[PDB]
């Protein structure tokens, strides 16, 4: 490879991109906050049912 740049070790060889051919092991967190508002809503409801137990 050309120049003084560092020796790239990126491990992307396995099929990951879901190319029209394949599926590919991609995990995306776009649902992070919606599950943040959900874990809270479910701590409150259990707090509302468990009452008055800590």
């Amino acid at each position: 490879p050309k120049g003084n740049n560092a020796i790239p070790h990126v491990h992307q060889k396995k099929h990951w991109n879901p190319c029209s051919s394949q599926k590919g092991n991609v995990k995306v967190f776009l649902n992070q906050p919606a599950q943040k508002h959900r874990r809270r809503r479910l701590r409150l409801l259990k707090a509302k049912k468990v009452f008055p137990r800590p």
Binding site: N4, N5, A6, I7
Partner: protein
């Protein structure tokens, strides 16, 4: 056509303007672009030269670099006449390695919070460039400083590692990776540690 080999090779790059989007820097150059023009003083047009240099070329000096340096000048000055001002166009930082700094009246573009307290707590001032135009409009009896630019890790990587007599830090994320040929003397060879030039 007139013959001028080049003519593209005596010409050099200067860049009067600034590459900074900071609105305050654009005021400070407004001041010195004015008063490096009309002032007839060496100091006052160096800080205008220096005020447009992008962050890389303005390297912070620590405190205790200002102190040590200015304690070297303060010895041979007449005991009657003392008014040196540390004038720095970069950032001034706080040195944990030194305590008990005298009172130096430093001037700078920006002070480390711990660096500014560590001045005034020891009795000095900190005065930024809109003041210093009032105190030293000729730059008179200032003391101008720069930074320390040669210890950066970017300057350390420059140059090839495997060239003889070049001590340079190669790019690797895993340091234990590249030790093993052309570094060790045992197998293929060791790059010569020193080379006459």
């Amino acid at each position: 056509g007139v013959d001028l080999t080049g003519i593209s090779k005596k010409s050099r790059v200067i860049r009067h303007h600034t590459y900074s989007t900071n609105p305050y820097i654009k005021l400070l150059i407004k001041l010195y672009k004015f008063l490096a023009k009309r002032t007839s003083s060496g100091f006052n047009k160096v800080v205008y030269q220096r005020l447009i240099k992008s962050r890389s070329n303005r390297a912070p000096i620590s405190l205790s670099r200002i102190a040590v340096v200015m304690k070297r000048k303060a010895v041979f000055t007449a005991k009657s006449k003392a008014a040196p001002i540390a004038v720095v166009v970069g950032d001034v930082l706080d040195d944990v390695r030194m305590a008990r700094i005298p009172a130096m009246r430093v001037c700078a573009l920006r002070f480390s919070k711990s660096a500014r307290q560590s001045i005034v707590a020891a009795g000095g001032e900190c005065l930024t460039f809109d003041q210093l135009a009032m105190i030293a409009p000729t730059g008179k009896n200032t003391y101008l400083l720069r930074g320390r630019k040669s210890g950066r890790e970017s300057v350390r990587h420059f140059g090839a590692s495997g060239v003889p007599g070049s001590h340079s830090k190669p790019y690797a994320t895993n340091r234990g990776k590249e030790t093993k040929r052309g570094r060790r003397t045992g197998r293929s060879y060791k790059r010569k540690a020193f080379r006459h030039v």
